[PDB]
Amino acid sequence: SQSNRELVVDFLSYKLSQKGYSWSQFPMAAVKQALREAGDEFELRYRRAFSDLTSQLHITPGTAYQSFEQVVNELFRDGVNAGRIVAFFSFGGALCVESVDKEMQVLVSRIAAWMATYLNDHLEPWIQENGGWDTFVELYG
């Protein structure tokens, strides 16, 4: 999905800018504003910044896609719901932040790619069964 690359690239750019980082390294406005709002609400509750999910991953130019997939999957031990998808987006935002902090900016576009693959593969199917991106709009702000 090109519609997905876009969403991923919005949320991360949004998060990177919000927290003072560069978005250079790179979807009705409705879904986009909804994801940004969702992510913000989520992070006020859980300000851990996925501290040990990132420990298990600890991303490097070496890291393979299958590794990110193994670790993101944990968000979904109990399957998909809207909150867990927001967490997915929020977890990538955190991976990007760390990456810039670790002087690994080269990785941020790579993470965006993985997020798209993952969204297309594992999450789109739940999404279409549960109203599509519209219910994120319905649900979030």
Swiss-Prot record:
BH2, short sequence motif: residues: 125-140
Outcome, altering G83A: No heterodimerization with BAX
Record's keyword annotation contains Cytoplasm: yes
Ribosomal protein is among the record's keywords: no
Record-level GO BP terms: apoptotic mitochondrial changes; apoptotic process in bone marrow cell; cellular response to alkaloid; cellular response to amino acid stimulus; cellular response to gamma radiation; defense response to virus; dendritic cell apoptotic process; dendritic cell proliferation
Post-translational modification remark: Proteolytically cleaved by caspases during apoptosis. The cleaved protein, lacking the BH4 motif, has pro-apoptotic activity. This phosphorylation is partial in normal mitotic cells, but complete in G2-arrested cells upon DNA-damage, thus promoting subsequent apoptosis probably by triggering caspases-mediated proteolysis. Phosphorylated by PLK3, leading to regulate the G2 checkpoint and progression to cytokinesis during mitosis.
Motif (BH1): 74-93
Tissue expression notes: Bcl-X(S) is expressed at high levels in cells that undergo a high rate of turnover, such as developing lymphocytes. In contrast, Bcl-X(L) is found in tissues containing long-lived postmitotic cells, such as adult brain.
One GO MF term: protein kinase binding
Record's GO cellular component terms: Bcl-2 family protein complex; centrosome; cytoplasm; cytosol; endoplasmic reticulum; mitochondrial inner membrane; mitochondrial matrix; mitochondrial outer membrane
Signal peptide range in chain numbering: none
Keywords from the UniProt entry: Apoptosis, Cytoplasm, Cytoplasmic vesicle, Cytoskeleton, Endocytosis, Membrane, Mitochondrion, Mitochondrion inner membrane, Mitochondrion outer membrane, Nucleus, Phosphoprotein, Synapse, Transmembrane, Transmembrane helix, Ubl conjugation
Residue interval(s) of motif BH4: 3-23
Chain ranges for the short sequence motif BH3 as given in the UniProt record: 31-45
Family: Belongs to the Bcl-2 family.
Function, as annotated: Potent inhibitor of cell death. Inhibits activation of caspases. Appears to regulate cell death by blocking the voltage-dependent anion channel (VDAC) by binding to it and preventing the release of the caspase activator, CYC1, from the mitochondrial membrane. Also acts as a regulator of G2 checkpoint and progression to cytokinesis during mitosis.
Domain commentary: The BH4 motif is required for anti-apoptotic activity. The BH1 and BH2 motifs are required for both heterodimerization with other Bcl-2 family members and for repression of cell death. The loop between motifs BH4 and BH3 is required for the interaction with NLRP1.
Subunit note: Homodimer. Interacts with BCL2L11. Interacts with BAD. Interacts with PGAM5. Interacts with HEBP2. Interacts with p53/TP53 and BBC3; interaction with BBC3 disrupts the interaction with p53/TP53. Interacts with ATP5F1A and ATP5F1B; the interactions mediate the association of isoform Bcl-X(L) with the mitochondrial membrane ATP synthase F(1)F(0) ATP synthase. Interacts with VDAC1. Interacts with BCL2L11 (via BH3). Interacts with RNF183. Interacts with GIMAP3/IAN4 and GIMAP5/IAN5.
Protein name (Swiss-Prot/TrEMBL): Bcl-2-like protein 1
Source organism of this protein record: Homo sapiens (Human)
Name of the gene encoding the protein in the UniProt record: BCL2L1
Residue range from the parent sequence: 2 to 196 of 233
